[PDB]
Amino acid sequence: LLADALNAINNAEKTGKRQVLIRPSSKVIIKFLQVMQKHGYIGEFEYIDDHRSGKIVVQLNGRLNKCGVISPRFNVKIGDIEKWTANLLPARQFGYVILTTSAGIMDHEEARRKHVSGKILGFVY
Amino acid sequence: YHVLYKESKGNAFKHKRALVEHIAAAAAAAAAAAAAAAAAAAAAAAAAAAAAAAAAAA
Amino acid sequence: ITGNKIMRILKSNGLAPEIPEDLYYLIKKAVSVRKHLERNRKDKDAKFRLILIESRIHRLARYYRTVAVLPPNWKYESATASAL
RNA sequence: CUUUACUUUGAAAAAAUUAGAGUGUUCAAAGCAGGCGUAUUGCUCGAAUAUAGCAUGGAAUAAUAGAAUAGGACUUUGGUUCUAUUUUGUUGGUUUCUAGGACCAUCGUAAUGAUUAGGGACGGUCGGGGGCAUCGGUAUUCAAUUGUCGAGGUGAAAUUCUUGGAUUUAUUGAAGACUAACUACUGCGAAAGCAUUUGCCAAGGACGUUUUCAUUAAUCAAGAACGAAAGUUAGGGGAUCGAAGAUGAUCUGGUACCGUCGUAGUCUUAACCAUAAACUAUGCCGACUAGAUCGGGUGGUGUUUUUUUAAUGACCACUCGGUACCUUACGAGAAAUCAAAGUCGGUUCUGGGGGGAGUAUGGUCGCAAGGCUGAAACUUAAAGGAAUUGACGGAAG
């Protein structure tokens, strides 16, 4: 469920699918995709009815190089973010780490602004 | 009674003394059933509530 | 022949997804295929085949055990069928 | 800072609408905030504690018993008596509020994004999955009998078998093993493994509308059970071919290939040892990414089969599972190639130069051959994989 997730949307950008077709719904999916919207990595999104769970819709615009998960959800600190950001992102300046902070799920540099620690989900660059 | 036979096989005796001195422990188990039967008071209270509902809506 | 077994253990009828029915199935028929292992002992695949279905009784003993056993339903199953 | 808001109920013909009530409790201190000098109340800040009711428990209300606290009437001042309040135990009507037990439906939308994840019941269906008990056919061999006179082998040969009638041809009888064809680019079993036909006990997978319990799940050191062939133990059986063993031939030699015979084995029950270059040289389980064949279910208002018309079909559309497999783009890699052995997680196993070594020794198992676990001294400077060129062949064209 975590493994598959960011690989599907990444391979969609690799080939050049304009919208990507992804699905599930319960309550760890969509607001870091609003952090991706703020940063300009994806575009708009909406919800479509299903029989069970739900269907998402995501609009892409050819931005993602590689996104992927951090499969063990390690502890990040308000100092040691960038020990991970060194290996996670091969580029610095480009990309960001998404932390599951204590103040919800937000960006990593936004997490230093709040001064809040937590776990990690994935990288985007 | 046949708990004393299961106190011979799996011996907790030795001789003729300890044999008859058991009978007290097995008899005490029956007291637990009387405590469990007290839970029926909740069902009696529910029957009184049903009678009060029928007296209200008529 | 399955249908005569169904109307015994269950609350209602048709619910072998009410799981003490699989426990009673495998126990009762494992001793019946062992009549066919009291037949000869050469026997290749039916001894292999028996391991699968008789070990499934232990996964059925893992079953209701882990989730909820406030009054233990697991100990009703193993009493009625005669397991562990 | 900020409400429109949310909700249980009444009055309304319905209904707009309207009327009333609610949106935690307790304690100490400090700040700000109505009316007053204050007190005190409300809110905020900080803590502690708990997070659907009607069996049960608390409070309100009533009674009774004990204890504590406050006030009054009395007192031969110890105490008694009355009243109010709190706490604890017990009982009953009514009002209000809180724990706990059994069973079932749906999967809605906001925080990793095209998700039915585990067990089956019901009803159809396929297969060489298993064990046992029967039965049939061909070929071979042996025994008896008829018609008829030499054969068998090989590169040539001989051992060998025949006038005491062989090979053989037919008839009759017996004993064991195997099932040609069908037979496949086929199916089943988790792997080992599974081919005549029929019957009984008995297992698993896949499909279909659904019905249904509601994380029950995944993986798993140890541990437990199962085990092709070869070998061992005890009792049977030995047709068809034969390790060991005995002759003939071949050669420089021939303890072999070849030919004539033949022992243990090969078959069977029970028990044991448990290994294979045990194989896809690729662990299991779940999600993403273009293209065959076999089984199930549905459709083909059209055509054909055909006289219990069941054609199960023909031939075409799909939709699912297994997927001999073929072939291939993206992509990866040292490359051949793969089509995931690309690539991903959760979990388990395993590797750290060659020789010495799966050995030495101990432990453990075994009836025994032997299995399992498992090094070092020392030696050495490489062992090894993928891919090329050319010579050669008792290789082909």
Side-chain angles (χ1 to χ4, degrees), chain C residues 48-63:
Chain C
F48 280 104
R49 194 92 270 136
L50 181 59
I51 299 163
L52 191 147
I53 64 176
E54 192 162 298
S55 293
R56 272 184 52 78
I57 305 179
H58 201 184
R59 201 160 83 186
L60 217 298
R62 190 181 187 267
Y63 213 93

Side-chain angles (χ1 to χ4, degrees), chain C residues 19 62-75 77:
Chain C
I19 62 89
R62 190 181 187 267
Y63 213 93
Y64 215 82
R65 171 192 172 212
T66 50
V67 50
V69 277
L70 286 298
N73 202 316
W74 181 36
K75 297 182 69 177
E77 297 177 65

Side-chain angles (χ1 to χ4, degrees), chain A residues 40-105:
Chain A
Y41 276 67
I42 62 177
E44 309 303 296
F45 24 72
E46 57 182 0
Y47 199 106
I48 296 180
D49 314 71
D50 202 1
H51 195 325
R52 60 197 79 257
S53 306
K55 296 277 171 183
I56 70 109
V57 181
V58 159
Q59 184 77 100
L60 300 170
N61 65 111
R63 298 292 88 224
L64 315 180
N65 291 276
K66 189 169 185 177
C67 51
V69 287
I70 318 302
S71 306
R73 296 183 286 170
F74 298 104
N75 297 303
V76 287
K77 326 202 296 81
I78 319 94
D80 292 76
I81 303 87
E82 72 172 76
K83 192 166 185 174
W84 282 268
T85 313
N87 41 60
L88 268 52
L89 313 181
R92 296 284 286 243
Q93 191 178 0
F94 281 129
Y96 41 87
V97 185
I98 296 298
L99 317 182
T100 293
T101 66
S102 195
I105 305 184

Side-chain angles (χ1 to χ4, degrees), chain A residues 2 5 22-32 47 53 55-56 66 71 105:
Chain A
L2 278 71
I22 57 289
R23 169 190 188 182
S25 196
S26 302
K27 207 262 295 185
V28 60
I29 53 192
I30 220 255
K31 83 164 46 67
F32 95 62
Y47 199 106
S53 306
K55 296 277 171 183
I56 70 109
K66 189 169 185 177
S71 306
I105 305 184

Side-chain angles (χ1 to χ4, degrees), chain C residues 2-3 5-6 11 14-19 22 25-26 29 32-33 35-36 39-49 51-53 56 59 62-64 66-67 71:
Chain C
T2 308
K5 182 178 56 72
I6 304 303
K11 310 186 210 77
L15 286 67
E18 183 187 346
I19 62 89
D22 185 55
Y25 176 38
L26 299 172
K29 292 292 295 186
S32 205
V33 65
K35 299 168 183 168
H36 148 91
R39 188 175 281 263
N40 202 272
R41 278 212 69 218
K42 173 83 72 165
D43 199 294
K44 40 189 169 186
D45 197 70
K47 298 212 298 291
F48 280 104
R49 194 92 270 136
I51 299 163
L52 191 147
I53 64 176
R56 272 184 52 78
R59 201 160 83 186
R62 190 181 187 267
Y63 213 93
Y64 215 82
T66 50
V67 50

